[PDB]
Amino acid sequence: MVPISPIETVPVKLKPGMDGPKVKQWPLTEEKIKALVEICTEMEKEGKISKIGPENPYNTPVFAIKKKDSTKWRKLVDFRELNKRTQDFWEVQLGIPHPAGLKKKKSVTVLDVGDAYFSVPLDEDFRKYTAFTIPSINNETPGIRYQYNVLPQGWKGSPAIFQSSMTKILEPFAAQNPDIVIYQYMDDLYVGSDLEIGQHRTKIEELRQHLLRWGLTTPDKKHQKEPPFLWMGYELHPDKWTVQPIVLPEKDSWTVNDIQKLVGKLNWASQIYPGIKVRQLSKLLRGTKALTEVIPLTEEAELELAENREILKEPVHGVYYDPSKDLIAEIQKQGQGQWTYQIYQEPFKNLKTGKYARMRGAHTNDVKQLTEAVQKITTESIVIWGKTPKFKLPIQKETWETWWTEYWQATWIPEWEFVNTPPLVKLWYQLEKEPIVGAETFYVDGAANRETKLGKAGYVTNKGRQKVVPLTNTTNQKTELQAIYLALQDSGLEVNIVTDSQYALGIIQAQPDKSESELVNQIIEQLIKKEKVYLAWVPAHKGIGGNEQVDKLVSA
């Protein structure tokens, strides 16, 4: 005998206050019982389960399921109740590697560790909670009782404990062999390197020798799996990656469900296919979730879908990461709150792509959205590569400087350069810091009756120009904006406007270039046409001339 090291046991508890499962065993047919007895006898011989005495009060139900197109049955021990009662574990797989962060490899070998799994013992003190019962033939003897000695398939802790156990064992090998990479997924280990093939094979033999220290064997006849690998929705090749085929179905009509799946596919595709768009398709899913409902595609959605089909007409691949080179991220504006980007190191060789959509809300502007997109790409890049890319952005350096220095919030974008690819992001209007000499001064106001929703909006000016318009189906806030709109409409290219509306100031000081409100959009359109606009706020009801006159005119 060659001594082997035991695999250290992970201590396991039930949740505080919870006892183990006591669930009734279902009756089974005589055929299923014989099958389960044979299956369990073999598992017992292999050391996976042990017969137990009558004292154990716990139970989990067991079922027998027929392996399709076969005369062989399979067992199912249904641990749902035990799982509810079992503590939470650290789950390592939560964040999966992105292919674009991986490094090129010459050789990747797959080693089967499915047998090693049953050398990981289940905590002795927890075993009692895994008890189950094979019913007896004709119920004329006590059912056969067993418990697990190993991590049960389907039990909450098995994946985490298996993985954590393998990682601990592999750690010294990885540390002392920095010229390879090792990744575990399910029952397989993947071992990569850039070594010449003989040396790579030597490393694999050395890994096998290391694992034997714990009595863990891997299969001599080497795995059938070899590049390319289908993994987590990707195709991995030695020196490039892509997504698995993206196939958009042909349909005469589309349901909510078809469209959710279509958007899901486009979203998945957008990580390597440049320029994918999903706004108009996603607009179709607004508010409704009857999966069977049929939604007519708008012309805009049909155009979006056609543009995507063209993008997807042939294969695109990403390259892997070279840590010796800078990362570059370039962004383009696509319209309707959509933005697209590519991350590369060498020109025309993308590591990945992606997209960003405008956040839901009342008002927005292109500079804010570009900023948001930069922060998303930055965070994504820290996750994947551990560093921020240098940015190439469709905004002039002078535009950015004007924006950030005058904006009421703190804002920052990391190192970047202008790329002159239209459409460029620009500032569409800029309010004056001081009142304009020689420009007419418009004192604006509006009011509405909260019951009838009737209102008035208007202005008076220092030249004696005046206007009041009666309005229906309106509110105090709408009339305050209406009044500013009237002043913009009726003034020359330079204008001073005096308002008491904290609401309107709050909107305009946010500097939107687009809004969900048709009125705000009309105001923005007017502002764009002016040469100079100074907007002054005063408090309401304080005897301030101009303001007081117009307030009286609009309140009735």
Partner 1 sequence: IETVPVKLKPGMDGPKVKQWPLTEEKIKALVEICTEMEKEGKISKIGPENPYNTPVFAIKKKDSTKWRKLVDFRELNKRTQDFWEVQLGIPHPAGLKKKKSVTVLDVGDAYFSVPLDEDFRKYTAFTIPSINNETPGIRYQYNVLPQGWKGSPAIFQSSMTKILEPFKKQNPDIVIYQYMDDLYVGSDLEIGQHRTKIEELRQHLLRWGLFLWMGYELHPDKWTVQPIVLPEKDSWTVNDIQKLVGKLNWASQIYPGIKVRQLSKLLRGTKALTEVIPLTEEAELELAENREILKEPVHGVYYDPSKDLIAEIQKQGQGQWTYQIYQEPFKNLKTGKYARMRGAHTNDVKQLTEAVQKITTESIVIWGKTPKFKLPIQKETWETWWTEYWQATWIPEWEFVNTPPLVKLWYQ
Ligand X SMILES: CN1CCN(c2ccc(C(=O)O)cc2)CC1
Ligand Y SMILES: Cc1cc(/C=C/C#N)cc(C)c1Nc1ccnc(Nc2ccc(C#N)cc2)n1
Query: Cα(184)–Cα(120) distance, rounded to whole angstroms?
Result: 15
Q: Quickly tell me which residue has 């909006």 as its tokens.
A: 457
CA distance 416 to 392: 6
Binding partner at 534 among partner 1, ligand X, ligand Y, none, C-beta below 5 to 8 Å by kind: partner 1
The contact mask relative to ligand X for 116-135 (x = CB under 6 A, - = no) is -x------------------
Three-state SS at 297:
coil
- To the question of whether residue 551 is assigned a binding role by annotation, the answer is yes
Which is nearer to ligand X, 153 or 244 (by Cβ)?
153
Helix 299-311 and helix 256-269: axis angle, to 10°?
Answer: 40
Using rule CB under 6 A, residue 153 touches ligand X: yes
Nearer Cβ to ligand Y (101/274): 101
Asked if 63 touches ligand X (CB under 6 A), the answer is no
Q: Interaction with partner 1 in 348-377: which residues (CB under 8 A)?
A: 368, 371-372, 375-376
Annotated binding residue 78 = no
Candidate residues 237, 390, 426, 514; the one interacting with ligand Y per rule CB under 6 A: 237
Q: How many residues bind partner 1 (CB under 8 A)?
A: 75
Is 445 assigned a ligand-binding role in the annotation? Answer: yes
Residue 152 interaction partner, one of ligand X, partner 1, ligand Y, none, beta carbon < 5-8 Å per kind: ligand X
At CA 128, angle to CA 123 and CA 133, rounded to 5?
A: 130
**540 near Mg ion, judged by CB under 5 A:** yes
Shortest distance, CB of residue 150 to ligand X, whole angstroms?
7
Q: CB 58 → ligand X: shortest distance, Å?
A: 17
Report the residue number, 91 or 531, with the smaller CB distance to partner 1.
Answer: 91
Is 194 labeled as ligand-binding?
Answer: no
Q: What angle do CA 102, 108, 111 make, to 5 degrees?
A: 120
| Tokens read off for 81 | 């109740």
* Residue 154 within binding range of ligand Y, rule CB under 6 A: no
The answer to the question of whether 188 is labelled as a binding residue is yes
Residue 438 has phi, psi (to 5 degrees) of 90, -10
User: Which long-range contacts does 397-400 make (Cβ < 8 Å, 24+ apart)?
Assistant: 399/367, 399/425, 399/426, 399/427, 400/367
Q: Is 326 annotated as a binding residue?
A: no
CA distances 429 to 400, 508, 525, 529, 532, Å, are: 14, 11, 10, 9, 9
Residues 6+ apart with CB under 8 A from 98: 352, 383, 384
Nearest-angstrom CA–CA distance, 32 and 74 = 9
Nearest CB to ligand Y, comparing residues 57 and 323? 323
19 marked as part of a ligand binding site: no
Q: Which residues bind ligand X (CB under 6 A)?
A: 114, 117, 152-153, 187
Residue numbers in the known binding site for Mg(2+) are 112, 187-188, 445, 480, 500, 551
Applying CB under 6 A, which residues contact ligand Y? 97, 102-103, 105, 108, 181, 183, 185, 190, 192, 227-229, 231, 236-238
